[PDB]
């Protein structure tokens, strides 16, 4: 709970989480072989953005983007129900 994710209701349509969603989904698919329902933020050494996503060619996927204190971003995880 201390150092936990904080849910950020009604932030789902903000451009920032749309760019992050696109960054996350496109990073993941680009390094795969062959072929916004919820926003949460966590203070770490930088910030984690945990985005629950509805994706389709339909799946519910969770992804975490880490932004470090130098502003460098990476996709920590991406998976689907």
């Amino acid at each position: 709970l201390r150092g936990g994710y904080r849910e950020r209701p009604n932030h789902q349509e903000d451009p920032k989480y749309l760019e992050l969603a696109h960054y996350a989904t496109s990073t993941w698919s680009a390094q795969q072989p062959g072929k916004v329902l919820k926003v949460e933020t966590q203070t770490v050494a930088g910030t984690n953005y945990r985005l629950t996503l509805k994706v389709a060619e339909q799946r519910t996927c969770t992804t975490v983007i880490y932004q470090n204190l130098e502003g460098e971003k990476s996709v920590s995880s991406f998976g689907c129900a």
């Binding site: 709970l1 150092g3 770490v44 050494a45 204190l69 990476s74 920590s76």
Partner: protein, 217 residues
């Protein structure tokens, strides 16, 4: 009369600054810091302790690894577990893993922990003066904290009740203006070589005295 300044780094109580990276493990870094100091006091040997061991193994005591936790539950894990592995035997990879504690590699123990009188900076000052480095929680949620570089951190919107970040008070002092000397877990490149001076005796600034504890060894 308590001293006017304490710096436990001068006495060899404090490990170099570490980096939690992408994991919500500040609680674990705060706990290893306070246990490193109490073990040093007991043994005369400074040994870096495994935050990864805490992240992976303290779920039964009600911590959630990289998803967050509490210094007190970490101290409770070490007590119930009968030990804690060294940083060197159980290195930090900044993700949630299945417990792989080995008792053969334990270099620390505790019998429990002491909570400092909540919200009492004079209690925190006695504890820091008499015991060593103290685990505390603070409000590190403000962008002013991220870009802190020098002097005394004061943040007018800082909560003494909504706390999100575990750190370690390694001393206190005054600028020629009283401060808590705080070790952070964001690598030595952040703030003042990984350290921050937080306003002391300014109505429990950022909740520094709200949730202060140390392990009993």
């Amino acid at each position: 009369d308590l001293p006017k300044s304490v710096d436990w780094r001068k006495k060899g109580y404090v490990t170099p600054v570490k980096n939690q990276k992408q994991c919500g493990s500040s609680w674990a870094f705060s706990a290893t810091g306070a246990l490193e100091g109490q073990m040093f006091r007991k043994t005369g040997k400074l040994v870096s302790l495994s935050e990864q061991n805490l992240v992976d193994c303290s779920r039964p005591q009600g911590n959630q690894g990289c998803n967050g936790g509490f210094m007190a539950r970490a101290f409770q894990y070490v007590k119930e577990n009968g030990g804690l592995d060294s940083e060197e035997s159980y290195p930090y990879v900044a993700v949630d893993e299945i417990c792989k504690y080995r008792p053969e590699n334990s270099v620390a123990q505790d019998t429990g922990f002491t909570v400092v009188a909540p919200g009492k900076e004079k209690a925190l000052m006695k504890a820091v003066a008499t015991v060593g480095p103290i685990s505390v929680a603070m409000d590190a949620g403000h962008s002013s904290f991220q870009f802190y570089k020098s002097g005394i951190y004061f943040e007018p919107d800082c909560s003494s009740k909504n706390l999100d970040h575990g750190v370690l008070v390694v001393g206190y002092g005054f600028e020629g203006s009283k401060y808590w000397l705080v070790k952070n877990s964001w690598g030595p490149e952040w703030g003042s070589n990984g350290y921050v001076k937080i306003a002391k005796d300014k109505n429990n600034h950022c909740g520094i005295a709200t949730a202060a504890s140390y392990p009993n060894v």
